[PDB]
From a paper:
RFCCtf18 is a seven‐subunit complex formed of Ctf18, Rfc2‐5 and the stable Dcc1‐Ctf8 sub‐complex. RFCCtf18 is a variant replication factor C‐like complex, the basic function of which is to load or unload a DNA sliding clamp in an ATP‐dependent manner 19, 20. Previous studies have shown that Dcc1 and Ctf8 are able to form a stable sub‐complex in vitro and that the C‐terminus of Ctf18 is required for the interaction with the Dcc1‐Ctf8 sub‐complex 39.
We identified a construct that expressed well in E. coli that includes the last 76 residues of Ctf18 (residues 666–741) with full‐length Dcc1 and Ctf8. Crystals of this complex (designated Ctf18C‐Dcc1‐Ctf8) were grown that diffracted to 2.4 Å resolution. The overall structure of Ctf18C‐Dcc1‐Ctf8 is extended and looks like a “hook”, as the C‐terminus of Dcc1 folds back towards Ctf8. The N‐terminus of Dcc1 from residues 1 to 115 forms a large heterodimer interface with Ctf8. Ctf18 binds as an extended peptide to a conserved groove present in the dimer interface of Dcc1‐Ctf8. The extreme C‐terminus of Ctf18 forms a short helix, which is partially buried in a hydrophobic pocket of the first “barrel” of Dcc1‐Ctf8. The structure shows that W736 and W740 make crucial contacts with other aromatic residues of both Dcc1 and Ctf8 as well as the extreme N‐terminal proline of Ctf8. The N‐terminal section of Ctf18 in our structure forms a beta sheet with Ctf8, with E724 from Ctf18 forming a salt bridge with R128 from Ctf8. Residues 666–713 of Ctf18 appear to be unstructured, suggesting they form a flexible linker between the Dcc1‐Ctf8 module and the rest of the Rfc1‐like domain of Ctf18.
Residue numbers in the entry:
A (entry chain A): 2 to 31, 35 to 242, 248 to 380
B (entry chain C): 714 to 740
C (entry chain B): 2 to 133
The structure:
């Protein structure tokens, strides 16, 4: 048997944390895990690896939980045992050093950026104005500082920074406006073809040079930092960058849909032409209406019209109602992105659809229609 | 007259609602 | 603020050691769970003064007075807990659904150490029985 001892005071600096399989593996790797919080008395505490984020929660319970450790007695522990039964001789001693009335639970969470003193850049030069007419006075200068004050991991943060089009100007972190981001892409693309650059292997220096070599600097907002931002948004690097041509085509197509087929429909091949015309000349891409799945519907099979998902009814039977009203027969994957959000009980997505829709075979192909 | 040691049994078990955690709740 | 979890000490001891079964963790720790309150006296110093060597209820370890409150007998997986003179509780050695890290939070430095990782517990859910 084991002799059980207790101290007169427990130490509450000892606490229990759930180690999910992934966290467990890291803890046995062989300082890769980090606790973080915006402040000391207010905000959530998160736990971060290089690559992932967990949130901490605590849950009190009603039982006694003693944490006990083996100890070596200074003197042998002698006492009269008075009964036999079901109790072998002591062979070791343990002492309760902590008593916990709760667990800290660890749950996977989406890392996010803390964007508070960070301005939008639209951006004329003499950005000093927007810098000094801001929220704080304090400047967030570096991405590292931004990350340090964020509820997310290094890699989650960098990835979001690239996806929202983060940049820096005059030593001040900023975020590019949708308009300027798009405009900056357009100018970078124009210039890259004009100088016969390798769009699979771009770098900041050559691309920066290509953009500004015939522009007077004091009127050139496309700094190296801006060029890097645009590459990290619309390209993939590795150390050079590779342009994401389909992503870029879609980006233009969505604008086209908004401009030409917002309240109105248009023949698909005639729309393609107008979509194609927004590109800078000679831009190598073959455009296809299926790149705009989730952003359009087809009132007839040879017409197209724009749709914003956000306008749709929230109840899924209502959503399916409105879509079939707009278009009787849907190719299966045209309609999937417009209804996935409502699939809350994580059904397999094609089961979710057959709950509200019917499959119908025409020629060879399979379409979907209302039940 | 000497030391008396025992478990006062709980008839069952309560797990409370989970709560947020502050930096200070850890230290 | 931010701080890393130091698991350095734990990783070397997990190599200088060997065994789990359950028994105890290799580092020498265990988790005891009881459906109830453990009632110990409010004043150890007073009762320790008065302590027979027949009872053997109090001892000094590293500057602390420890009360000897019970005995634990493992036979399965099955476990029996004797508390004080008059109680027997029947329980179970349970493998944890989710392993539990014991972390020590040193407030002076705002630093945190991995003390051990608990994978088993011994738990007692049922009303205490009379002795034997």
């Amino acid at each position: 048997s084991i002799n059980l001892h207790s101290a007169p005071e427990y130490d509450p600096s000892y606490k229990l944390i759930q180690l999910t399989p992934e966290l467990l593996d890291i803890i046995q790797d062989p300082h890769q895990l980090r606790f973080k919080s915006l402040d000391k008395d207010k905000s959530e505490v998160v736990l971060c690896s290089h690559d992932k984020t967990w949130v901490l929660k605590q849950r009190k319970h009603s039982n006694t939980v003693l944490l006990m450790r083996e100890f070596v007695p200074e003197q042998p522990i002698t006492f009269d045992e008075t009964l036999l039964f079901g109790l072998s001789k002591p062979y070791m001693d343990v002492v309760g050093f902590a008593k916990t009335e709760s667990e800290f639970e660890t749950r996977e969470t989406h890392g996010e950026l803390n964007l508070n003193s960070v301005p939008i850049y639209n951006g004329e030069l003499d950005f000093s104005d927007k810098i000094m007419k801001r929220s704080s006075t304090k400047v967030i200068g570096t991405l590292e500082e931004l990350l340090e004050n964020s509820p997310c991991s290094a890699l989650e943060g960098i990835s979001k920074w690239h996806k929202i089009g983060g940049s820096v100007k005059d030593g001040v972190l900023c975020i590019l406006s949708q308009d300027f981001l798009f405009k900056a892409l357009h100018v970078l693309l124009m210039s890259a073809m004009a100088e016969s650059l390798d769009l699979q292997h771009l770098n900041v220096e050559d691309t920066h040079h290509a953009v500004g070599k015939d522009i007077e600097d004091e009127f050139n907002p496309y700094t190296r930092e801006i060029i890097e931002t645009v590459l990290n948004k619309f390209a993939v690097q590795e150390n050079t960058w590779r342009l994401r041509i389909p992503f870029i085509a879609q980006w233009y197509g969505i604008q086209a849909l908004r401009k030409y087929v917002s309240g109105i429909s248009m023949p698909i091949d005639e729309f393609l032409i107008k979509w194609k015309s927004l590109f800078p000349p000679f831009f190598p891409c073959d455009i296809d209406i299926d790149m705009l799945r989730g952003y359009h519907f087809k009132p007839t099979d040879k017409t197209v019209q724009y749709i914003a998902k956000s306008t749709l009814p929230m109840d899924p039977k209502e959503r399916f109602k409105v879509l079939f009203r707009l278009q009787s027969q849907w190719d299966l994957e045209d309609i999937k992105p417009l209804i996935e959000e409502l699939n809350s009980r994580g059904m397999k997505i094609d089961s979710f659809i057959m709950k509200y829709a019917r499959r119908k075979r025409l020629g060879k192909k399979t379409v979907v229609t209302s039940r | 007259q000497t030391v008396k040691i025992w478990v006062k049994y709980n008839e069952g078990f309560s797990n409370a609602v989970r709560k947020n955690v502050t930096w200070n709740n850890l230290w | 603020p931010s701080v890393d979890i130091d698991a350095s000490q734990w990783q070397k001891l997990t190599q200088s050691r060997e065994k789990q079964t359950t028994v105890i963790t290799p580092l020498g720790m265990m988790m005891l769970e009881i459906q109830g309150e453990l009632e110990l006296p409010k004043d150890f110093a007073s009762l320790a003064r008065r302590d027979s060597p027949n009872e053997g209820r109090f001892s000094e370890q590293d500057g602390e007075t420890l009360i000897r409150f019970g005995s634990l007998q493992i036979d399965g997986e099955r476990a029996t807990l004797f508390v004080g003179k008059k109680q027997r509780l029947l329980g179970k050695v349970t493998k944890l659904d989710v392993p539990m890290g014991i972390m020590h939070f040193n407030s002076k430095d705002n630093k945190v150490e991995l003390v051990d990782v608990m994978k088993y517990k011994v738990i007692f859910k049922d009303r205490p029985l009379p002795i034997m």
